Amino acid sequence: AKQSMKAREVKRVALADKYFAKRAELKAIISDVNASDEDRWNAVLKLQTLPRDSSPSRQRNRCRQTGRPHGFLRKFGLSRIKVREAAMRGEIPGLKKASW
Amino acid sequence: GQKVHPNGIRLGIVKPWNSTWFANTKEFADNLDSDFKVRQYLTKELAKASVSRIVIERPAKSIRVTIHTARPGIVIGKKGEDVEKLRKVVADIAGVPAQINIAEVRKPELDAKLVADSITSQLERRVMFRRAMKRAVQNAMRLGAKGIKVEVSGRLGGAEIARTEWYREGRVPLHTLRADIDYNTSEAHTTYGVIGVKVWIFKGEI
Amino acid sequence: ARIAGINIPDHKHAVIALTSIYGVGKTRSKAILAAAGIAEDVKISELSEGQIDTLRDEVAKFVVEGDLRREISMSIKRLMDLGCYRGLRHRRGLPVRGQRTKTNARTRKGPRKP
Amino acid sequence: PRRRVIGQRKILPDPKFGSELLAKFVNILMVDGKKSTAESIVYSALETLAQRSGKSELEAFEVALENVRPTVEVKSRRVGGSTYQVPVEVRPVRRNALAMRWIVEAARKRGDKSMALRLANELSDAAENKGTAVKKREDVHRMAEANKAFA
Amino acid sequence: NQYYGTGRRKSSAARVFIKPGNGKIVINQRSLEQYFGRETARMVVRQPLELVDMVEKLDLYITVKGGGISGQAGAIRHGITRALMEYDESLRSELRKAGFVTRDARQVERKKVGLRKARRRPQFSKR
Amino acid sequence: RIRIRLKAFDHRLIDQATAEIVETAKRTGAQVRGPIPLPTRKERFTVLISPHVNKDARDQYEIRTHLRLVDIVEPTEKTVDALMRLDLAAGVDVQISL
Amino acid sequence: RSLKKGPFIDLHLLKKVEKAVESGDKKPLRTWSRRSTIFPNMIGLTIAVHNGRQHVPVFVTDEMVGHKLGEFAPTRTYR
RNA sequence: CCGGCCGGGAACUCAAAGGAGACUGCCAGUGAUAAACUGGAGGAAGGUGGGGAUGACGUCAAGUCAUCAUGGCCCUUACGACCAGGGCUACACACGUGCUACAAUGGCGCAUACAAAGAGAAGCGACCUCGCGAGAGCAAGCGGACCUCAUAAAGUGCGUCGUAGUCCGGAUUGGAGUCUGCAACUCGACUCCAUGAAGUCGGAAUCGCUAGUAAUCGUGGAUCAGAAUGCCACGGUGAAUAC
Ligand SMILES: [Mg+2]
Ligand SMILES: [Mg+2]
């Protein structure tokens, strides 16, 4: 729960989607079957500048309330310890405990 | 940690839900986060006014928030100005229209969370934990309580160590998967340290 | 039985002999028999030399044992002269098929000395 | 265990010809659950034994059943502490299973060709009393004759 | 005329239609020797008929699926008994003694937490 | 024409929500088809519980998501006149597809 | 193995050599981009490849054609 | 144009709901005629029939203040903040759980059967072109009992291999490559071509299992840009013994 670390995800996500990660104009065009022209170098010409801060592969895709890199679930938004506590409390529509 | 939460096992069987909205696996996290944030903001802003439980619902993205309290006179405030104001806050935080519904509890000693909040407020006053717990349980049993179990753990009374004390009056069948019970927990950060409470109250059979 | 001048893969199918040959294994045996026009269900002790010389010529196109280890040694010289991390790992005389060495490399690091 | 004293399951006979003996004989050699090949090989071996002996299968082995099946076993109840042989009566309920186990142990030997050739060969050797499964029959007899009237 | 038999061992759904006049067999438009006539359970589908009549009195049309070979083969061994109702009294009071009528409700127990399998406990150390 | 496919959480809720639809479209809506069971998904997965340690502690939570179909065949206008902005059994998700 | 269309290189590494090759580079170069490979232009160099505590100076030979800089950075001290 | 493809039926599998039934219910007998237990017929289902979550007071002042919070305390232009690279993958060595093998109830090649369960929208991606191949281009359809992942695999037969480290087995590196992500050696995975060990089924000692279980065969889900033999699940074939 390091504030700073949580902020790190914040500054990561604040520019990833605002920038090349969705604005993938430069790489998308370049890395293809087109001519082996200057475009090959041009590709990394932008990436050297690119804030490393911003790309999807970078972000950990972790929880939000706790800020915990592990146990997170891509489908709920929180860690295991918190999602279970909310589940057996009732704040998870239609989710309950079953057996086989 | 071997005792199961005796409501997670009864939610989809006999107990009512609290976050009711169906959707696809694209907005689950966002909706649940908005709900959690607004709900903790509500339990922070209206704590002193008996919020017994707070249930949520999201129909076609015009959400409903039901708040079961015991002091609606102060919740509504002046003709509901505070209500319509909190309606702005919920809509701002959730990005959607909001509809608030205030429900009233008759005897606040019917809500485990409410009695736990009472005990939490009492134990932050250098009060006698026994004179609080026994008084609450007898207050419940007099008006009628087919079962009650109230446990308190921590540095109670300055024990300086991990100490727990529970009081039982009636039948509290936490193993029978047929009944309806009320249960919740609270925490008091007395200057000694924190003190946790566990309150189960058993009235229903079906 | 006589291909390469040295190897005698006798009593081996037309392809089993080539697989047993030093220099090539499973695939080049079939490639050789295909480019030469022979089946892969008969031993080598039945084929005459009029075809064995052709098999010899057909295998004389790729690198051979006499040059297999020479190319390997050339790559090893490249590594040792570069001094790369791989060159060092090889010059320390350790097993060679991959990357992991700490706790499971016993196969070519031999048994424990102490 | 200690509470229950239940017995053994029922045996499902062969779909070819009713033989719980042969069903157990096959289940003893059965391994890993890959039963298609096991059945395909055992039935082939047995239909070959059929002509190897001149008679059908259910009787081809009935001649070596006695050669293999002994009449004694060993159970060492500690006497103030004891762990050596102590002769006892063998249970015929599972003596057939013990014989099926010994004969397959022996058939795994003679190993040069496939099973279909070697298990039938070992059963024929047992019929002429020439198998290690037939020798186990006397081995246990020797081990039992040593300490008579023990318990 | 026409009699329907349902079958179900080990998730294996079997759907049988039996008629009088012939005694042929067809498994999902396939023959017995075509699918498993010389494999495991190559005869269990005939035992219920071999008990009363198999050769040419009652001809069959089968559709089995939903699992393994042995599964579908026991599914037929069952569905035959369910289709055998034209003389239900004599087809049941006689066969119930030999079996072939039970569902054999056997289900593979799920992968169990902690356990590496349905029943195997992982390996210990004790030290 | 209106391929009606709805998704809900509970069966005692999806049935109660289909009841009013299959009553409205019959009193006005000209003989819709028959409610269809549509096999369902539950998302049976293993999650985790204990803090820090005891990997052998797990929980098996599920979300039984029921599915149903109606497939109104008559393209009458009273169908839409009755299905005009109504949401019953809040906590579910229906859809009007043609 | 690596990129199929265009060997990946960094600009801080490229530009410092491409333009100084006309001068001879006269000196080492502190490389913080060890994730790059070599090409016939980058030989004759005396570059200090970062390896943690410091930058190891290395002379470049024509044999280092398709190898990276960190390929020989000894962070494996081991005595 | 045999594709339920098109009419056609809701006969049938299947489907998601609502119910049915099973209970010692009935008969025999050792037994305090009690209870109970072996048995017997009926019995889709036999003795809590499937199993599953359910962990009672409590014990280790067990573990966790690095899920989270709070006390008490320390620091604070620093125990705080940020940037690049290395590390946790460094290994003479100890130990522990798993995948692979030690082969002929088996390896190799042809064709050849049926699963079940779950996933899939800045995602699953048929078809089709190219490429031995890893994948690369065109790219519908599908937010889904319809479109995709996605071909189950051991098996079935045939032919070969014929007891040798042998067509076994496959490992810690060569060379050429394929994808991921800016980025693939320090430190990803994958194919191909090539070399090919140890191990000939294992000492003391020790581990699991009472049935659709053990044993194995594959399949999918998480996490995830990529990254398992591991974790969690699906179903396939299929034991022995419990004196
Ligand atoms: Mg080594
Ligand atoms: Mg401890």
The greatest inter-chain interface is formed by:
A-B, 17 and 25 residues
Main sheet characteristics of chain G: 3 strands, mixed
Q: Structural class of the secondary structure composition of chain G? A: alpha+beta
Strand order of the largest sheet of chain G: 1-2-3
Shape of chain A: elongated
Rg over C-alpha atoms of chain G, rounded to the nearest angstrom: 13 Å
Q: Say which molecules are bound, naming each kind only once.
A: magnesium ion
Q: What percent of residues of chain A adopt helix (DSSP H or I)?
A: 25-40%
Secondary structure category of chain A:
mainly alpha
Q: What oligomeric state do the depicted chains represent?
A: part of a larger assembly
Series of secondary-structure elements of chain A, N-terminal to C-terminal:
HHHHE
How many domain regions of chain A? Answer: 1
Number of domains of chain G: 1
What order do the helices and strands come in, and which of them pair?
The structure is cut from a larger assembly and holds seven protein chains of seven kinds.
Chain A: H1 3-16, H2 25-30, H3 39-49, H4 80-87, E1 96-97
Chain C: H1 14-20, H2 26-36, H3 49-59, H4 65-82, H5 85-91, H6 106-109
Chain G: H1 11-20, E1 30-31, E2 46-50, E3 55-59
Parallel strand pairs in G: 1-2
Antiparallel strand pairs in G: 2-3
Chain E binds one RNA strand of 243 nucleotides through β2, β3 and α3.
How would you summarize what this structure contains?
Chain E has one domain. Chain E contains four helices and three strands; from the N terminus they run ββααβαα.
Q: What are its keywords?
A:
part of a larger assembly, 7 chains, B: about 210 residues, alpha/beta, GMP Synthetase, Chain A, domain 3, Ribosomal protein S3 C-terminal domain, 2 domains, four-stranded mixed beta sheet, four-stranded antiparallel beta sheet, about 30% helix, globular, C: about 110 residues, mainly alpha, Helicase, Ruva Protein, domain 3, 6 helices, about 0% strand, binds magnesium ion, RNA-binding, Small ribosomal subunit protein uS13 (chain C), tRNA binding (chain C)
Structural overview:
This is part of a larger assembly, with seven protein chains of seven kinds. Chain B is α/β, with parallel strands linked by helices and 206 residues long. Chain B has helices spanning 28-45, 72-76, 81-94, 112-122, 129-144; strands spanning 19-20, 53-57, 63-69, 98-104, 147-154, 163-168, 180-190, 193-204. Chain B has two domains: 16-106, 2-Layer Sandwich (GMP Synthetase, Chain A, domain 3); 107-206, Ribosomal protein S3, C-terminal domain (Ribosomal protein S3 C-terminal domain, 2-Layer Sandwich). In chain B, helix 1 packs antiparallel against helix 3 (81-94). The longest helix of chain B has 18 residues, at 28-45. Helices cover 51% and strands 0% of the residues of chain C. Chain C has six helices and no strands. Chain C has helices at residues 14-20, 26-36, 49-59, 65-82, 85-91, 106-109. In chain C, helix 1 crosses helix 2, helix 2 (26-36) packs across helix 3 (49-59) and helix 4 (65-82) packs across helix 5 (85-91). Chain E has one domain. In chain E, strand 1 and strand 2 form a beta hairpin. Chain E starts with a strand and ends in a 35-residue tail after the last helix. The chains are: A mainly alpha (100), B alpha/beta (206), C mainly alpha (114), D mainly alpha (151), E alpha+beta (127), F alpha+beta (98), G alpha+beta (79). Strand 1 of chain A pairs antiparallel with strand 4 (61-62) of chain F, so a sheet runs across the interface. Bound molecules: magnesium ion (2 copies). Chain E binds one RNA strand of 243 nucleotides through strand 2, strand 3 and helix 3. Chain D: Keywords: Ribonucleoprotein, Ribosomal protein, RNA-binding, rRNA-binding, tRNA-binding. Chain D: Belongs to the universal ribosomal protein uS7 family. Chain D: One of its GO terms (cellular component) is cytoplasm.
